[PDB]
Amino acid sequence: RREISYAIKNIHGIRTGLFTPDMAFETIVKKQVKKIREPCLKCVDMVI
Amino acid sequence: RREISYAIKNIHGIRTGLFTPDMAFETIVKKQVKKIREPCLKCVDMVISELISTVRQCTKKLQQYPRLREEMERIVTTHIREREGRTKEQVMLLIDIELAYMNTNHEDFIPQLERQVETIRNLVDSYMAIVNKTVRDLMPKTIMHLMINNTKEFIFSELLANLYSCGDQNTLMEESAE
Amino acid sequence: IRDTLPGLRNKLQSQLLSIEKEVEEYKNFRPDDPARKTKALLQMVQQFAVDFEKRIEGSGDQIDTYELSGGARINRIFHERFPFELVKMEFDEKEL
Amino acid sequence: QAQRRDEMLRMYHALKEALSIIGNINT
């Protein structure tokens, strides 16, 4: 929650008071799905 | 409505916008608060006209001496004209400042296209009212701090110097035959 | 004649104010423009890049509202009409 | 753009001359 609040507060950089920015969701999912890269490679290693 | 719809469909233009975007509101209000340049300049010129009429009206009673009412009017009116440029410049710059930030943490209250456009309009109208209030409270003050509360000080301070310094003192005060 | 002069002076001051900004980047001009060429190249490249990003990504600073206005939403109508070209073309029954 | 730029330059010089004339006439 703090991690995404900072994203809100950075992409609302100067302008103010508007609903919600979608690129906050964008950046957070891009940060969450970048660590899927380890389990998939581990499964490939297991299959090997 | 059509302009807002297109702004919504273009400012998150490549990807499905799951939140009502913001630069559209900014673009609409910025496109609407730039038509104020005409009424404010019209107000400034109208005030200039009445204030020159007042100077002529309150110099008419100086007809005791001719050739000095002419000088006095010719100096005060030239001062007012030399001040109209500055006051119009500041008038333009005030609204030009208003076109910069689009504050929304003021007392402004906090398909899918129709709902998005309705939400955008309910905010555009509010901010139009709140910028109208702020330009209505600062058009008088802007005019007078530059025009009136400065021509008054010109009258009370500098008029005497110009009148005494202009040449041919003997003819500046012509005794009228009357 | 002397009454009119203040108006002319202030109006021409406003016009010179309008032109002086353009004269700012035009203080000097030499043949073959050794550095103006590179500077203008950078300006054009930055304008093109920011306009591409504004046209497709949808950056800020006043995107036009006149038309459907650029590939971004045309590109979207492709990404969300292709799921109709998938449905339409493929079919068979009672031979399977 | 080249003709526009040169005509801007000439316009600026002409306006400078006009304001100099206003200065030397208003006196």
Residue numbers in the entry:
A (entry chain I2): 385 to 432
B (entry chain N): 385 to 494, 653 to 720
C (entry chain P): 289 to 384
D (entry chain P): 721 to 747
Question: Any passages from the paper?
Answer:
Dynamin (isoforms 1, 2, and 3) is the founding member of a ubiquitous superfamily of large GTPases and is best known for its role in catalyzing membrane scission of cargo-loaded vesicles during endocytosis. Dynamin molecules are recruited to the neck of budding vesicles to assemble into a helical collar and to constrict the underlying membrane. Two hinges are present; Hinge 1 connects the BSE and the Stalk whereas Hinge 2 connects the BSE and the G domain. Various cryoEM reconstructions confirmed that a GG dimer interface forms between two dynamin monomers in helical configurations, and the three conserved Stalk interfaces are vital for dynamin to polymerize into filaments.
Here, we report the structure of a two-start dynamin helix at 3.74 Å resolution. The MBP tagged Dyn1ΔPRD self-assembles into long and straight two-start filaments in the presence of GMP-PCP in the absence of lipid template, same as the untagged Dyn1ΔPRD. It shows a two-start helix with a rise of 13.58 Å and a twist of 24.43°. The three dynamin domains are radially distributed, with the G domain making up the outer surface layer, the BSE in the short middle layer, connecting the G domain and the inner Stalk domain layer, which forms an extended oligomer. The two-start helix comprises of two strands, which are joined by the conserved GG dimeric interfaces contributed by the GTPase domains of the two opposing strands. The density for the bound GMP-PCP nucleotide is clearly discernible (inset). Neither is their density for the PH domain when reconstructions were carried out with or without applying helical symmetry. The two monomers of the GG dimer share the same overall architecture but are not symmetrical, consistent with the GG dimer in the one-start helix12. In comparison with the one-start GG dimer, there is about 3° rotation around Hinge 1 which brings the terminals of the two Stalk domains closer by 8 Å in the two-start GG dimer. Furthermore, the Stalk interface 2 and interface 3 serve as fulcrum points to allow small relative rotations of the Stalk domains, while preserving interface 1 accordingly.
